[PDB]
A paper describes a structure:
Human NAD-dependent isocitrate dehydrogenase or IDH3 (HsIDH3) catalyzes the decarboxylation of isocitrate into α-ketoglutarate in the tricarboxylic acid cycle. It consists of three types of subunits (α, β, and γ) and exists and functions as the (αβαγ)2 heterooctamer. HsIDH3 is regulated allosterically and/or competitively by numerous metabolites including CIT, ADP, ATP, and NADH. In this work, we report the crystal structures of the αβ and αγ heterodimers and the (αβαγ)2 heterooctamer containing an α-Q139A mutation in the clasp domain, which renders all the heterodimers and the heterooctamer constitutively active in the absence of activators.
Crystals of αMICT+Ca+NADβNAD belong to space group C2221 and there are two αMβ heterodimers in an asymmetry unit, which form an (αMβ)2 heterotetramer through a noncrystallographic 2-fold axis. In this structure, there are an ICT, NAD, and Ca2+ bound at the active site of the α subunit, which are clearly defined in the electron density map; in addition, there is an NAD bound at the pseudo-allosteric site of the β subunit, and the ADP-ribose moiety of NAD is well defined in the electron density map albeit the nicotinamide moiety is poor defined. In the αMICT+Ca+NADβNAD structure, the active site is bound with the substrate ICT, the cofactor NAD, and a Ca2+ ion. In contrast, compared to that in the αMβ structure, the α large domain in the αMICT+Ca+NADβNAD structure exhibits a 6° rotation toward the α-β interface owing to the binding of ICT and NAD, resulting in a “closed” conformation of the active site (see Discussion later). The binding of NAD to the active site induces the α large domain and in particular, the β3A-α3A and β12A-α8A loops to rotate toward the α-β interface, resulting in a closed conformation of the active site. In contrast, in the αMICT+Ca+NADβNAD structure, the N-terminal regions of the α7 helices adopt the active helical conformations and the sidechain of Tyr126A also adopts the active conformation, which lead the sidechains of Asp230A, Asp234A, and Asp217B in proper orientations to form coordination bonds with the Ca2+ ion. Thus, the Lys184B-Asp230A-Tyr126A triad appears to be in favorable geometries for proton transfer.
Author numbering:
A (entry chain A): 3 to 47, 49 to 337
B (entry chain B): 14 to 82, 91 to 352
Write the structure that this text describes.
Amino acid sequence: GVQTVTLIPGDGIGPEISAAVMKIFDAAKAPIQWEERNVTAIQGPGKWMIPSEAKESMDKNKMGLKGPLKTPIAAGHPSMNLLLRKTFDLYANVRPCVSIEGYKTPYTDVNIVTIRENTEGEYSGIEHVIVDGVVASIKLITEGASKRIAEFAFEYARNNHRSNVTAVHKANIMRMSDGLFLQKCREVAESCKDIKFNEMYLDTVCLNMVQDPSQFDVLVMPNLYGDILSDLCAGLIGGLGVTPSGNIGANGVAIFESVHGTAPDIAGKDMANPTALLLSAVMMLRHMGLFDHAARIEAACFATIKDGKSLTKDLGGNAKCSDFTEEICRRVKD
Amino acid sequence: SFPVTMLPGDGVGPELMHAVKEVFKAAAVPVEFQEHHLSEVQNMASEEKLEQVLSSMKENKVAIIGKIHLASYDMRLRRKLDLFANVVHVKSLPGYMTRHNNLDLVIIREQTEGEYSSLEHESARGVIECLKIVTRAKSQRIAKFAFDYATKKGRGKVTAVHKANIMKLGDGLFLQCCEEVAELYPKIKFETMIIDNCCMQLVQNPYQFDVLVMPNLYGNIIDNLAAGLVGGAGVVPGESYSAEYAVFETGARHPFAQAVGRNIANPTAMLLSASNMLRHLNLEYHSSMIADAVKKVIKVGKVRTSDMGGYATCHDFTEEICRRVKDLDEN
Ligand SMILES: NC(=O)c1ccc[n+]([C@@H]2O[C@H](COP(=O)([O-])OP(=O)(O)OC[C@H]3O[C@@H](n4cnc5c(N)ncnc54)[C@H](O)[C@@H]3O)[C@@H](O)[C@H]2O)c1
Ligand SMILES: NC(=O)c1ccc[n+]([C@@H]2O[C@H](COP(=O)([O-])OP(=O)(O)OC[C@H]3O[C@@H](n4cnc5c(N)ncnc54)[C@H](O)[C@@H]3O)[C@@H](O)[C@H]2O)c1
Ligand SMILES: [Ca+2]
């Protein structure tokens, strides 16, 4: 059977990397049809919203693949990524970090999964100018979201045969909010003794992660911590050009995207790395139970990387993004 | 001769301060430490101990301190002493090899607002708000400090780290006050980076950074990330400033409570910022001497604590420096 995935190409470098992965999908003869709509437009109706056509495509198809959306610095419209995740209750962000065999970095055999609460934390859209020159941004942690992401991560650890979950938090500094996040992970930890559990302050994790990534497995944090730690560990294995992600909700609703943003400094050119959005479309295929297409698409990009010859700029190469994609497609088909 | 306020602090704090005192004695350093005990003191007696430290500082102007713990004691201390600016010098130690050798970075963190003021409440059952404060006043001071640091120390780039795309009002204010004062220093290159990106940059290629300025929470993240790059805590020093006071700490502050009563803690970080202290007291001979004795003992690699791949105890490592130091003064 053939299934339809909503495609949001996104801003900056997103249109070129989507084209890439689409093109690699046709090469691999995947049972995928793309329905293209643009969440890039942000519309003011007080409320901010996703254009009607994107909302219906997702509600019809309930699989998404998406390039980065630009969010203005200190000025314009709110994150339409935040908006996407909240309007579809994509409460779990899944950011595995795994060493790429044929690409050498100073760290070896990194196998990290950052699991980040996607809906609340310091990434609520809530700030208030108290008086002139005094701003208060509001972080929000709730029982129900904290319990739910903790259940997700213990459950993820079983699905992928991971053995430890680490609650990452700052409950010393923020006693009420992180306290509630951590107390709720302790509870789900006590209901799943088949999984070894521990907790670590966020600074300590980053102080250790860069020294010995060997010590970590699955990570759970509220929103703002997971955002930062997942970029931290992208540094370990090759950078923001290889690191996939997926926004998971209930009932098999999900939008897959790479961890990286828009890359405005390499946008017009053909320098992008698509393996990030590729590897997340690989997550997307496995989510859909299309395992044997996922296996080949993956195997090809890795083989393409373990060779050398055609690696993109960010991985020590001279190759255009187009040139890079063609070698993946060449390797699929055979 | 010189009176210095001393707060040993938590965990290995006291065992670290002890190594400083021993190294100073061997170097015959003309400093007399006035010890004060602030960590986990009863809550009713807190503000009085807080005040005599305030007044001890009024006499001594300089201090060296361990890690501490309606706001937290740390915040109260920082506030009573107005220690708005924190600086942590991330620098590779020549014999101590990591994945990021030859690294020279400075991290300037403001440490009197943001997520650290303890402003939380329950707005419904299960629903908890936490308020992070950004003010023009404080963000102005810390950006001027960063740029004065860059000017004073002959640095050339100052990079402001923010999350102003999604926290547009809070981090926006911090970011544009840095933009404002970045024009008052046209001889210094100003850049800006979103914080997650920058932590990716810090791991993959930290050599493009020079000097960094950020609010409190991001400073905690990056203080510890960068310390990790050059060999961790145990090795990286920091100091914090007011308009009058200079207080010297370790760079990535942690109590290391698991190490108390073992003989395993690394006094390298505390000894180094002790030498940074002695420079601030115009004891450049004593500071230069203690510092590159510590660096030489580490470089030769005969005696090293367990976090630096050796097997030596804290005391053995401290005595190794004192022997080196006490010999330098002879030769
Ligand atoms: N929707 C999302 O998932 C997402 C994520 C992050 C940032 N953003 C948004 O996009 C903009 C990004 O700002 P930023 O500079 O922090 O984004 P960024 O993640 O692109 O960081 C900038 C740099 O990271 C490197 N890089 C990232 N992706 C790369 C790739 N595929 N190939 C090669 N190099 C790559 C390059 O140095 C790039 O220039 C912001 O407006 C921000 O709001 C969106
Ligand atoms: N005692 C309890 O019952 C309890 C309960 C909950 C939390 N805690 C607190 O959690 C803390 C542990 O968490 P943390 O994140 O602050 O870790 P931490 O205090 O152990 O420091 C983090 C790491 O940094 C290194 N380090 C720090 N100082 C060093 C030195 N002088 N020499 C060599 N290495 C050094 C060590 O590798 C250390 O493990 C405890 O120390 C404790 O105060 C304690
Ligand atoms: Ca990110």
